[PDB]
Scaffold this active site. Structure first.
Site, PDB file in Angstrom:
ATOM      1  N   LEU G  38       0.823  -1.201   0.000  1.00 35.39           N
ATOM      2  CA  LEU G  38       0.000   0.000   0.000  1.00 35.39           C
ATOM      3  C   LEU G  38       0.866   1.263   0.000  1.00 35.39           C
ATOM      4  O   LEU G  38       0.440   2.314  -0.475  1.00 35.39           O
ATOM      5  CB  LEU G  38      -0.954   0.006   1.201  1.00 35.39           C
ATOM      6  CG  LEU G  38      -2.360   0.575   0.964  1.00 35.39           C
ATOM      7  CD1 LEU G  38      -3.181   0.627   2.242  1.00 35.39           C
ATOM      8  CD2 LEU G  38      -2.306   1.948   0.308  1.00 35.39           C
ATOM      9  N   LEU G  40       2.674   4.511  -0.416  1.00 38.45           N
ATOM     10  CA  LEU G  40       2.174   5.105   0.828  1.00 38.45           C
ATOM     11  C   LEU G  40       0.659   5.237   0.813  1.00 38.45           C
ATOM     12  O   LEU G  40      -0.012   4.655  -0.040  1.00 38.45           O
ATOM     13  CB  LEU G  40       2.775   6.491   1.088  1.00 38.45           C
ATOM     14  CG  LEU G  40       4.225   6.690   1.510  1.00 38.45           C
ATOM     15  CD1 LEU G  40       4.516   8.177   1.579  1.00 38.45           C
ATOM     16  CD2 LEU G  40       4.476   6.037   2.856  1.00 38.45           C
ATOM     17  N   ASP G  41       0.143   6.027   1.760  1.00 41.21           N
ATOM     18  CA  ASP G  41      -1.292   6.249   1.877  1.00 41.21           C
ATOM     19  C   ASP G  41      -1.909   6.499   0.508  1.00 41.21           C
ATOM     20  O   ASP G  41      -2.870   5.831   0.109  1.00 41.21           O
ATOM     21  CB  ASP G  41      -1.547   7.435   2.814  1.00 41.21           C
ATOM     22  CG  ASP G  41      -3.024   7.671   3.097  1.00 41.21           C
ATOM     23  OD1 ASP G  41      -3.871   6.856   2.676  1.00 41.21           O
ATOM     24  OD2 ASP G  41      -3.342   8.689   3.744  1.00 41.21           O
ATOM     25  N   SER G  42      -1.333   7.421  -0.251  1.00 40.99           N
ATOM     26  CA  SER G  42      -1.706   7.586  -1.642  1.00 40.99           C
ATOM     27  C   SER G  42      -0.630   6.993  -2.539  1.00 40.99           C
ATOM     28  O   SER G  42       0.320   6.360  -2.084  1.00 40.99           O
ATOM     29  CB  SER G  42      -1.926   9.056  -1.983  1.00 40.99           C
ATOM     30  OG  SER G  42      -0.717   9.778  -1.887  1.00 40.99           O
TER      31      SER G  42
END
Ligand SMILES: CCCCCCCCCCCCCCCCCC(=O)OC[C@H](COP(=O)([O-])OCC(O)COP(=O)([O-])OC[C@@H](COC(=O)CCCCCCCCCCCCCCCCC)OC(=O)CCCCCCCCCCCCCCCCC)OC(=O)CCCCCCCCCCCCCCCCC
Ligand SMILES: CCCCCCCCCCCCCCCCCC(=O)OC[C@H](COP(=O)(O)OCCN)OC(=O)CCCCCCCCCCCCCCCCC
Lengths: 68, 57, 141, 84, 167, 458, 86, 114, 505, 173
Positions: G38, G40-42
């Site tokens: 994943l 990063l977060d985005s």
């Protein structure tokens, strides 16, 4: 094999209809149909000339046509 | 179902029927042959030339 | 056969909190700014207390917008405010308030003057004065 | 109104009678048998009579001396014409 | 929308309107990291006003540079031949009015239908009344317990569970 | 003549005298038959019009107009059958009697031989109609439609009887139209305006001007089951023709004041059709059509100079059918779904496929495609009313635009996907739904083949 | 009419996800849980659906992003959209 | 032109006490779907906002009306006004066209119609 | 052939419909010069068109009724060209104007589809309002509408009666100011717009004015507004063509600007040389569209000019159909319409012309190149770009049979039609230098600026997505506000006032 | 057919053939073909009934009225005598419509009979035609009373204006 199931609401109440027209609308149509040809074949409008017709001609039935 | 007659492409660039293109190419002539008679015989203008009406006399 | 208090009664105010929401919840808390207020310019009997108006405009926008249905198809239970112009109206365009069309529609209006002249090809302009002579000037023969 | 009866108007029988009493009386005896009547019905508004008689009478004048479409006010000097 | 994910809805569309501007398939691809560079320039810092200028000034420079007639992904919220096929739309429950002699066809299928109903004939007594137990008063989004604690039948039956297909 | 009133009054005890449920089919069977008699001796001249008795010339006049009047009766019992099957037979015997009790006078009127049988029979309705509106309504607003339907119709039609008794003893005898062979004109005074205004305004309050129509949608919005008498009240209105018997003569030469009836209804014709676009109730939406291209005749009649009567007659019986039939659709689609609110019914055209072509041919004859009667009834209006003054081409040219957006928006509202919540609407239009909806488009378009049978003398 | 199955969607999704050199093609395919991938977060979750739209191409709804934890979950409901396997 | 339409404005952080603007609506879509999902219904829903949409629009004005403000006596500028105008336009014609039909002949002699 | 020997045109007296006061209208047909040639053409294309649909619509369960809807259309559009009784022209005039509604409205739902109908029947009805004016004017003056009689007994002042006609011209001929209807008239099925826009329905607007040639030759007012109009239609369509992203849309404007040349040719008095254009032109754009069928369908769909690819991936024949026709429309070097577009700017161009259209029109001739080359270079040129699993199969007996007939009946057509005519006029035939290839002179650099700019659009040095430009270009910007306005300033102003606001007060 | 002098037309002038050429003409492979697939099923049937029709000959006569009633008859207030004085006048306004029809079609035979000249030929119809209708709407057209047709009450009160004005008030005459 590869197949699906057709979906239509009803065909029957529409097909059960249109007959009562098409059946009946002919039923007195066709008998009325011969009389528009046969009655004209042996019988038609003629001719002219003139006539003094003696005292007076007939009443209505001055027309030129089979049924008129 | 219907049939397998041609399989699709994963971008392996599907093959032709080999009578597909030749039968067409004969109609690449009908533009290049029918363009024959353009310059033969016709020029950019087939006209006659206005001879500058000098006789104002 | 809804019995009592079907629709709006003599507003705009009697107890703005009494209406929304007694029934007909336009606002939740009696102030959503959906309170049955918008009787702007009254004395016109138009739109009395009305769990209703000036809620905003330009469309239900008809997109994904998918809690259930939410806009023009599928009919969420009760929001209805103003409608019937909403099936022939949408939202914000890319530019804003540029009339360059009246510019272009008048762009040719520049060439109105190009109308008062002619286009006669032969001969050229050849700045002249009294050389014009469309038909004849001097003697015939 | 469908206990899988077919039905048109109301109930078991005369419903079946009630369809033939509309379809047959309604048309094929009127929209057809009647429509025939006015189809070739005799000359309407005495125009048929008029074509020929507004045909013959054209040449009668045109033949000898007479003009065509006078509008002479129906034989004047039958009228004293009050002046003032 | 929670403040965390607010860039996504921009981050989804940002490159979206990009590709309809670029032409060559590499052009989109070559500007990827290059325009991707700007996102993480400040990667970890305040969630509030400090980095709200990553939200604040994102407005301009986007809307500015907007509407080059984007690629619309034809079947979708807009654009050509999206909702196109309604001439079927699958009016589920067309099975009511028939006058059999129209029902001779698909006998195995008429057998199957009446077998589905038994679930919806009575699933209710614990299906509905559990919703009187499940939501205490004002409950937000209304689905039941995801299992319904033993066997959901459907429970959402059948309007969402049997709903209409696409062809 | 008695060839007609006598069998149609003979109908009257063909009904109750019968048994139980046989009643409907009993009278619908006969009521069709009279239509053979209807044509039978009629559609004689033509030239030098038919008058067969002292106080009746049935219709000669070239205003045949009577054949329709005898149609719509056994179109009712096919129409009215739906929810009237739910109360008692001795009341159901009534509703067929008064409905005939109407049909008997509309044969008396349109003949009348004169002025003064017209009037007492011109006011002789409103006894039978008013009783059908108030009973067998639906909403409770009906009780006011009872009054408003009077207090106009009767309000100003009393000044007739002050005027027509004023003529009877002034010049000779009005006993007969067919003698006007002495008529002096009406020059001017402050008395004669009133005479002309008294002999007129009673008729206007029936075929509405854009004023004083305030009753017309009040009675139609809320009105009996099937449109049972709503089909009849779209005959009644157009039957204000009698202005054709007067204004042709009997004060011919005042056109002086015509203009407040021209520019008042000529700017309403462009108007009330436009206040019909946002309507949320369907039986309202049709009720405002009925004003519009009916109120066009009032600018056809006042102007003299035929080519208007060529076109003014075709209109009285133009929407006489189309405007009839629409009230027959909006009834049916209401049987199944009990709101008259237009929005609610959407997502049809999948579920009732055969009734698709029924809406279309209806909404197509307000468009007035060229071949049918409708245009050949409008394009003799525009040809004379153009010669009046060239500028009439604009407004009544606009009428031919807003009316097209008008009609479609009613059809195209029923093409959408809606499955939505309705478990109702199963019945696939059992024959009567499509039988009584026919016997309109079949006879209507048909006349275009030999359309010399709808025309005035000119 | 074009035949569709549940294998290709396990392959195609396995395929381009194995095409990206940012992912070694020894890594899990059907279940990695994607929270390991994943980062990063985005730039993952919305990043991965940028390409997968380029093949099928329906809209990839927003609120369906949070289903993308399970690599079997993404392939899971794409069957329900386009009317896929029995 | 029509309109800005204000796709950005002031915010942040004031009026973050304003919440339960959704609780107003969230109550219903819970209750509405609590209505809308049931096995046995077969019928339309009340939807009061529509009942109060027409009935507060068509009726319920002449009851609410008062003939007072001279912006409600406005209509003389609207209703009667142009209806006088159309008389002024016509009555000049039908006359200007009439005078010539007497002295002088504008038409041709192949006009029988009319 | 019977005519191109002895002449001898005919009409028929058949059947008396009602006869009112004096004028007696019955019915008839007209065999005239526009009848003898065109009608074979309008049937000849439609001979080839249904086969295409026969493959395209092959899977639709309602197909049986489709060909019914498509059939009346041809029937009644066919009675417009043949009728000499002015009323009879109006039976099929609106008979077709309804058919648009019942075709564009094919797909239900699709909130755009059935609102593209309500456009078609809104703008035609205005464009109706004219032609009922010149239907009135002839009675009050001439006491007939017969196309024979007007031409025998000539009207003096046509000023008012004719300008009405020029308005109904613009309704169905898609002129400027009524134009916004075509680009949204494409939202239906593909073979529809093939039939709607090629030889039919768009031709009546400039057709009808031709039929009036003998009377219209006078009265410079008439001639004046025409070429002061049609020429302007071109550059608002051209300037709106570029940047547009759909196969179907660009092929919509291409026929939108084909109009500007036609209507100009009525402006200068060129009755026949205008109509020969359509006879020739119609052979193009049916092919051109019907070509794109195998592109849209067999790609499963896109109809975007993005995601196209190059010339040859299993599309050998269809891509030869484009580069023939899409070459032909470019000014006809030896090809079909060599007698159509080419014999105009070289003939009527010697006249009283406004000295603007000369500037204006010939510039539009340029974009005729970039029209073509754009939708050629994104579809037939660049690298393949479009998602995988593309099934394309062009071996299609029910398709290849259709194209092959047109392109053959294309190349030979222009010369056969033209070679056989009785000559009706005198072309100048003395054409000096620099007036000569001045069209071809422009296209020569069009292709130059086509490819140089194509590579400059894509293959260039990366001119960035620089946010600042002026696009009033790709929108046209007229469809933006007005359609946000006309359903406001009227529907919500002259109704909500007039509504229960007033009638109930 | 019809009455010649009721519908005169100029003669045929059949065009001369001009083969001039060595090449085949297809019409001669059609007019020689088409004729043989037409005459048999066609002309035999018309001959078939026209003898089949020899079996019976009807009659319908030529209806001619009896004109005593005049225009100056009789009483002022009268009914009986002025009932008929329209029947004279009404029929004689149904005639004068149609005599405009017949004369109008004769005009068309000046055009598509020729149509190339349209101008230097026919010598008659147009220069006559507008001398016809100008003999129409005057005194034979009650306008704008045409709605009522105002028979004989207004019919002679144009023609009073066509008397009480012309020929006397003309000043000086
Ligand atoms: C009369 C005028 C005919 C021309 C206009 C009608 C156009 C044809 C048509 O009806 O399209 C129906 C078609 C129905 O669409 P649908 O809702 O998808 O079909 C639903 C059902 O299948 C129901 O719709 P449908 O498409 O199936 O229509 C039923 C039709 C379908 O089957 C057909 O036979 C096709 C009918 C087309 C020609 C009809 C006779 C033409 C003469 O069945 C019949 O024809 C029954 C036999 C009737 C014989 C009548 C003989 C004379 C009396 O389109 C229309 O609704 C509009 C029709 C009007 C077109 C515009 C008219 C003005 C131009
Ligand atoms: C308003 C009331 C004013 C009426 C004025 C009086 C009417 C009148 O005098 O009639 C004029 C005339 C009869 O009177 P006179 O002039 O003496 O006749 C000569 C007899 N040798 O000639 C007449 O006989 C005309 C008599 C009929 C006129 C009656 C109707 C006049 C008013 C009708 C109003 C129209 C509708 C308005 C009412 C509806 C709302 C309530």
């Amino acid at each position: 094999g590869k197949r699906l199931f057709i979906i239509k609401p009803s065909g029957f109440y529409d097909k059960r209809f249109l007959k009562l027209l098409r059946f009946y609308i002919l039923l007195t149509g066709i008998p009325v149909a011969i009389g528009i040809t046969l009655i004209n074949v042996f019988i038609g409008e003629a001719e002219l000339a003139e006539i003094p017709e003696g005292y007076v001609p007939e009443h209505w039935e001055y027309f030129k046509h089979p049924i008129s | 179902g219907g049939g397998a007659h041609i399989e699709p492409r994963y971008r392996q660039f599907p093959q032709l029927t080999r009578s597909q293109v030749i039968q067409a190419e004969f109609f690449s002539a009908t533009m290049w042959f029918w363009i024959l008679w353009r310059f033969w015989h016709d020029s950019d203008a087939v006209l006659g030339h206005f001879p500058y009406p000098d006789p104002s006399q | 056969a809804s019995h009592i208090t079907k629709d709006m009664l003599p507003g705009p105010y009697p107890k703005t909190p009494e209406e929304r929401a007694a029934a007909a919840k336009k606002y939740n808390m009696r102030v959503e700014d959906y309170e049955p207020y918008p009787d702007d310019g009254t004395g016109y009997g138009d739109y009395p207390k009305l769990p209703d108006r000036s809620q905003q405009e330009r469309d239900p926008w008809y997109d994904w917008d998918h809690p259930d249905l939410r806009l023009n198809w599928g009919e969420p239970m009760h929001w209805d405010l103003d409608m019937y112009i909403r099936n022939r109206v949408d939202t914000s365009p890319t530019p804003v308030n540029w009339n360059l069309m009246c510019k272009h529609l008048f762009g040719f209006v520049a060439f109105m003057l190009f109308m008062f002249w002619v286009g006669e090809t032969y001969p050229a302009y050849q700045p002249v004065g009294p050389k014009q002579y469309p038909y004849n000037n001097l003697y015939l023969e | 109104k469908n206990p899988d009866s077919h039905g048109y108007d109301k109930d078991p029988a005369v419903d079946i009678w009630n369809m033939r009493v509309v379809f047959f009386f309604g048309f094929s005896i009127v929209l057809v048998l009647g429509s025939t009547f006015v189809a070739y019905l005799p000359d309407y508004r005495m125009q048929e009579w008029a074509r020929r008689e507004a045909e013959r009478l054209v040449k009668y004048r045109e033949a000898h001396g007479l003009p065509i479409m006078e509008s002479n006010c129906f034989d004047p000097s039958k009228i004293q014409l009050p002046e003032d | 929308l929670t403040h965390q994910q607010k860039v996504l809805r921009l981050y989804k569309r940002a490159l979206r309107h990009l590709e309809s501007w670029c032409i060559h398939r590499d052009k989109y691809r070559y500007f990827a990291c290059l325009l991707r560079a700007r996102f993480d320039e400040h990667k970890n810092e305040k969630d509030m006003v400090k980095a709200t200028q990553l939200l604040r000034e994102a407005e301009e420079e986007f809307w500015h540079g907007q509407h080059p007639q984007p690629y619309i992904f034809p079947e979708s919220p807009g654009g050509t031949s999206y909702e196109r096929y309604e001439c079927y739309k699958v009016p589920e429950w067309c099975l009511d009015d028939w006058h059999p002699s129209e029902k001779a066809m698909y006998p195995d299928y008429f057998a199957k239908r009446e077998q589905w109903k038994k679930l919806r004939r009575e699933s209710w007594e614990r299906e509905v009344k559990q919703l009187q137990e499940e939501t205490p008063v004002g409950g937000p989004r209304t689905e039941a317990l995801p299992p319904a604690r033993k066997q959901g039948d459907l429970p959402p039956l059948w309007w969402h569970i049997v709903t209409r297909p696409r062809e | 003549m008695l060839k007609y009133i006598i069998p149609t009054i003979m109908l009257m005890p063909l009904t109750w005298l019968s048994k139980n449920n046989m009643i409907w089919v009993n009278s619908t069977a006969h009521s069709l038959l009279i239509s053979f008699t209807s044509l039978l001796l009629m559609n004689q001249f033509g030239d030098n019009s038919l008058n067969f008795s002292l106080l009746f010339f049935s219709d000669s006049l070239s205003t045949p107009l009577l054949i329709l009047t005898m149609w719509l009766l056994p179109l009712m019992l096919m129409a009215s059958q739906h929810h009237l099957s739910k109360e008692n037979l001795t009341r159901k015997k009534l509703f067929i009697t008064m409905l005939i009790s109407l049909q008997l006078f509309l044969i008396m009127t349109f003949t009348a031989m004169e002025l003064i049988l017209f009037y007492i029979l011109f006011e002789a309705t409103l006894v039978p109609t008013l009783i059908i509106i108030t009973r067998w309504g639906n909403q409770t607003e009906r009780l006011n439609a009872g009054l408003y339907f009077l207090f106009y119709t009767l309000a100003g039609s009393l000044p007739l009887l002050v005027a027509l008794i004023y003529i009877q003893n002034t010049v000779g005898s009005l006993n007969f139209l067919m003698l006007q062979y002495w008529v002096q004109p009406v020059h001017n005074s402050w008395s004669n305006v009133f005479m002309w205004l008294a002999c007129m305004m009673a008729f206007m309050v029936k075929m509405p001007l854009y004023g004083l129509h305030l009753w017309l949608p009040k009675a139609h919005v809320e009105a009996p089951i099937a449109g049972s008498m709503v089909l009849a009240a779209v005959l009644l209105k157009l039957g204000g023709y009698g202005m054709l018997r007067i204004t042709l003569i009997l004060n011919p030469m005042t056109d002086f004041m015509a203009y407040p009836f021209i520019m008042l209804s000529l700017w309403g014709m462009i108007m009330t059709s436009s206040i019909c676009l946002r309507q949320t109730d369907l039986k309202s939406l049709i009720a405002y059509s009925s004003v519009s291209h009916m109120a066009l005749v009032i600018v056809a009649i006042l102007i003299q100079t035929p080519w208007s009567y060529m076109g003014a007659t075709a209109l009285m019986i133009a929407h006489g059918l189309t405007s009839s039939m629409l009230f027959c659709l909006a009834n049916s689609n209401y049987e199944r779904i009990h709101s008259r609110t237009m929005i609610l019914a959407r997502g049809l055209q999948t579920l009732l496929p055969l009734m698709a072509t029924w809406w279309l041919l209806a909404s197509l004859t307000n468009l007035a495609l060229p071949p049918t009667i409708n245009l050949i009834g409008e394009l003799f209006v525009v040809m004379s009313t153009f010669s009046w003054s060239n500028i009439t081409i604009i407004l009544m040219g606009v009428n031919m635009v807003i009316t097209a957006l008008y009609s479609l928006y009613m059809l195209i509202m029923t093409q959408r996907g809606k499955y939505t919540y309705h478990i109702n609407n199963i019945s696939p239009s059992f024959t009567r739904e499509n039988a009584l909806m026919s016997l309109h488009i079949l006879p209507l378009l048909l006349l275009t083949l030999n359309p010399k049978i709808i025309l005035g003398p000119l | 009419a074009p035949p569709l199955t549940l294998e290709g969607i396990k392959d195609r999704v396995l395929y381009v996800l194995k095409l990206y050199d940012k992912i070694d093609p020894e890594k899990l395919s059907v279940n990695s849980h994607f929270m390991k991938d994943l980062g990063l977060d985005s730039l993952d979750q919305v990043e991965i659906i940028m390409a997968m739209e380029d093949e099928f191409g329906f809209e990839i709804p927003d609120i369906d992003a949070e289903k993308l934890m399970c690599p079997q979950e993404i392939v899971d409901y794409i069957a329900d959209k386009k009317d896929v396997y029995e | 032109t029509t309109l800005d339409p204000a796709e950005y404005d002031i915010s942040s952080e004031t009026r973050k006490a304003q919440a339960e603007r959704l609780a107003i609506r969230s109550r219903l879509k819970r209750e509405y779907q609590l209505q809308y999902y049931d096995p046995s219904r077969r019928g339309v829903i009340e939807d009061p906002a529509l009942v109060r949409w027409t009935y507060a629009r068509s009726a319920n004005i002449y009851p609410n009306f008062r003939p007072n403000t001279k912006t409600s006596l406005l209509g003389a500028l609207f209703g009667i006004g142009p209806l006088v105008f159309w008389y002024y336009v016509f009555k000049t014609d039908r006359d200007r066209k009439e005078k010539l039909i007497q002295e002088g002949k504008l038409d041709r002699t192949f006009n029988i119609s009319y | 052939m019977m005519f191109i020997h002895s002449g001898q045109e005919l009409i028929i007296s058949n059947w008396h419909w009602l006869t009112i006061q004096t004028l007696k209208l019955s019915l008839s047909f007209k065999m005239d010069y526009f009848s003898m040639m065109f009608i074979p053409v309008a049937l000849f294309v439609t001979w080839s068109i249904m086969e295409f649909s026969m493959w395209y619509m092959y899977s639709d369960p309602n197909i049986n009724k489709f060909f019914k809807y498509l059939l009346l259309f041809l029937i009644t559009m066919l009675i417009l060209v043949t009728a000499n009784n002015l009323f009879q022209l109006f039976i099929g005039w609106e008979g077709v104007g309804i058919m648009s509604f019942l075709l564009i409205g094919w797909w239900y739902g699709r909130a755009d589809a059935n609102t593209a109908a309500l456009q078609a029947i809104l703008y035609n009805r205005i464009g109706d309002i004219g032609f009922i004016l010149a239907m009135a004017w002839f009675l009050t003056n001439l006491n007939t509408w017969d196309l024979q009689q007007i031409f025998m007994l000539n009207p003096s002042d046509s000023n008012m009666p004719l300008i009405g006609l020029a308005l109904a011209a613009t309704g169905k001929s898609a002129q400027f100011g009524l134009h916004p209807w075509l680009p949204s008239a494409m939202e239906g099925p593909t073979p529809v717009s093939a039939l709607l826009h090629s030889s039919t329905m768009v031709v009546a607007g400039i057709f009808l004015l031709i039929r009036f040639y003998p009377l219209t030759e006078n009265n410079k007012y008439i001639q004046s507004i025409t070429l002061c109009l049609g020429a302007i239609t071109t550059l608002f369509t051209a300037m709106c063509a570029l940047t547009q992203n759909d196969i179907k849309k660009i092929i919509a404007f291409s026929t939108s600007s084909q109009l500007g040349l036609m209507m100009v040719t009525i402006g200068i008095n060129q009755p026949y040389l205008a109509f020969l254009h359509i006879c020739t032109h119609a052979f193009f754009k049916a092919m051109l569209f019907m070509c794109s069928g195998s592109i849209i369908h067999s790609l499963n769909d896109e109809q975007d000019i993005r995601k196209m690819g190059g010339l040859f991936k299993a599309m050998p024949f269809t891509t030869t159909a484009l580069i023939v026709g899409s070459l032909a429309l470019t000014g006809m070097p030896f090809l079909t319409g060599f007698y159509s577009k080419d014999l105009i700017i070289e003939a009527a161009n010697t006249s009283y012309t406004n000295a603007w259209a000369l500037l204006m029109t010939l510039i539009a001739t340029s974009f005729t190149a970039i029209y073509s080359t754009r939708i050629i270079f994104f579809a037939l040129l660049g690298q393949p770009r479009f998602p995988t699993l593309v099934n394309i199969n062009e071996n299609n007996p029910l398709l290849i049979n259709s194209i092959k007939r047109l392109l053959i009946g294309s190349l030979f057509a222009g010369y056969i039609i033209s070679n056989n005519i009785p000559p009706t006029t005198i072309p100048q035939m003395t054409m000096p230098y620099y007036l000569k290839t001045t069209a071809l002179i422009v296209t020569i650099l069009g292709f130059i600026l086509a490819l140089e700019i194509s590579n400059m659009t894509k293959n260039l040095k990366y001119h960035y997505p620089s946010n600042a430009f002026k696009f009033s270009t790709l929108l046209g910007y007229f469809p933006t506000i007005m359609h946000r306005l006309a359903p406001y300033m009227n529907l919500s102003m002259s109704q909500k006032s007039a509504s229960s606001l007033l009638d109930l007060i | 057919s019809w009455d010649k002098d009721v519908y005169p037309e100029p003669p045929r002038r059949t065009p001369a053939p001009s083969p001039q050429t060595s090449l085949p003409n297809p019409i001669t492979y059609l007019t020689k073909a088409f004729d043989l697939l037409v005459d048999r099923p066609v002309t035999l049937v018309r001959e078939f009934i026209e003898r089949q029709h020899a079996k019976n000959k009807y009659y319908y006569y030529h209806r001619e009225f009896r004109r005593v009633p005049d225009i100056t008859e009789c009483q002022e207030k009268d009914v009986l005598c002025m009932f008929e004085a329209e029947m004279q006048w009404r029929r004689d306004y149904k005639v004068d419509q149609e005599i405009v029809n017949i004369i109008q079609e004769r005009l068309k035979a000046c055009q598509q009979r020729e149509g190339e000249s349209h101008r230097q030929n026919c010598a008659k119809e147009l220069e006559q035609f507008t001398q016809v209708v100008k003999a129409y709407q005057d005194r034979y057209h009650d306008l704008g009373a045409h709605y009522s047709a105002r028979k004989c009450l207004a019919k002679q009160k144009q023609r009073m204006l066509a008397e009480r004005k012309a020929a006397k008030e003309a000043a000086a005459a």
